[PDB]
Ligand binder design. Structure first.
Ligand SMILES: N#Cc1ccc(Oc2ccc3c(c2)COB3O)cc1C#N
Ligand SMILES: [Mg+2]
Ligand SMILES: [Zn+2]
Length: 323
């Protein structure tokens, strides 16, 4: 078991680590497991002077604030998105571009980015006049909530993993984490992608092939898109993995739709189990959102995302063939 887990973790730095297996061999604590592994691997506990006690206490509490009864937005998704962010941060075209603080912020953002998710969409919370929707004026409702919960937990006993950052580092990491978690709001996707496209149209590259990211706005725009890419990375994974993720998301979609029906609401796109095509939905989603995003990302970091994009396109065609 320890041996099995260690074996899965050989793939820690690789796209398509099998996080499902990690969850199995870590007694269903994939977020705590993978975060500890990532922080050990990048030396973040040492660099930011975080004790293992404090770190594991925060991560255990964080993971406990993901809902195990929600089919997709649970701690396995968080873990997967944290591990994918960790891989993307090490893309060659981005070597030496980001600071230790930016790396910390990205992985932390990815870890907390869906904490306390109820398993329904922002539109559902809005259309049902949720307390959260009211709190945040219908604006990035769940994403504002994830941030509020992920940060509040840092104030629990033995949980402040940022205690030994400098004041300015703490302030800057909070802003960057906010930015990256808000970037997982699908409402911001088109503007994120437009900015990424600009990034690409005007990219500055060294002789070695590494991207030149002068100002802070350039860096955070890449980091936002990076976390958004990691959040939408399921279709770019090996088909056996992606299919597992699809099963989960449709289960979650069908539950929301059942809630909408029982409340006499109009059922949301892809949430009516009696009429939904899982395959058609995935293809549409890849065509309209995921592929344009990842193709632009691939352009930014060319050729580093060649296999990812090839996998995306192959999975797209496979699902389309299953319609
Ligand atoms: N079709 C479609 C489709 C449409 C929107 C969408 O938006 C998102 C994207 C990421 C996250 C969330 C919603 C909630 O928390 B995040 O994991 C996902 C799918 C899909 N699949
Ligand atoms: Mg989300
Ligand atoms: Zn997510």
């Amino acid at each position: 078991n320890e041996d099995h887990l260690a074996k899965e973790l050989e793939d820690l730095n690789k796209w398509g680590l099998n996080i499902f297996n990690v969850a199995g061999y870590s007694h269903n604590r994939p977020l705590t497991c993978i975060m500890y592994a990532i922080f050990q691997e990048r030396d973040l506990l040492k660099t930011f002077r975080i004790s293992s006690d404090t770190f594991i206490t925060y991560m255990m509490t964080l993971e406990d604030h993901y809902h195990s009864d929600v089919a997709y937005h649970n701690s396995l998704h968080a873990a997967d998105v944290a591990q994918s962010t960790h891989v993307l941060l090490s893309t060659p075209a981005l070597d030496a571009v980001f600071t230790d603080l930016e790396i910390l912020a990205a992985i932390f953002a990815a870890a907390i980015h869906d904490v306390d998710h109820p398993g329904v969409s922002n539109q559902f919370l809005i259309n049902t006049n949720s307390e959260l929707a009211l709190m945040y004026n219908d604006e990035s409702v769940l994403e504002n909530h994830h941030l509020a919960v992920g940060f509040k937990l840092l104030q629990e006993e033995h949980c402040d993993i940022f205690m030994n950052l400098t004041k300015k580092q703490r302030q800057t990491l909070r802003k960057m984490v906010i930015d990256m978690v808000l970037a997982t709001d699908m409402s911001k996707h088109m503007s994120l992608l437009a900015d990424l496209k600009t990034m690409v149209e005007t990219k500055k590259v060294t002789s070695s092939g590494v991207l030149l990211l002068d100002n802070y706005t350039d860096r955070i725009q890449v980091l936002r898109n990076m976390v958004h890419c990691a959040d939408l990375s399921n279709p770019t994974k090996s088909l056996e993995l992606y299919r597992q993720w699809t099963d989960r998301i449709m289960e979650e979609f069908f539950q929301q739709g059942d809630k909408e029906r029982e409340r006499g609401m109009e059922i949301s796109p892809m949430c009516d189990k009696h009429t939904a095509s899982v395959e058609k939905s995935q293809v549409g989603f890849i065509d309209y959102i995921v592929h344009p995003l990842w193709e632009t990302w691939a352009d930014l970091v060319q050729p580093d995302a060649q296999d990812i994009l090839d996998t995306l396109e192959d999975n797209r065609n496979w699902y389309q063939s299953m319609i």
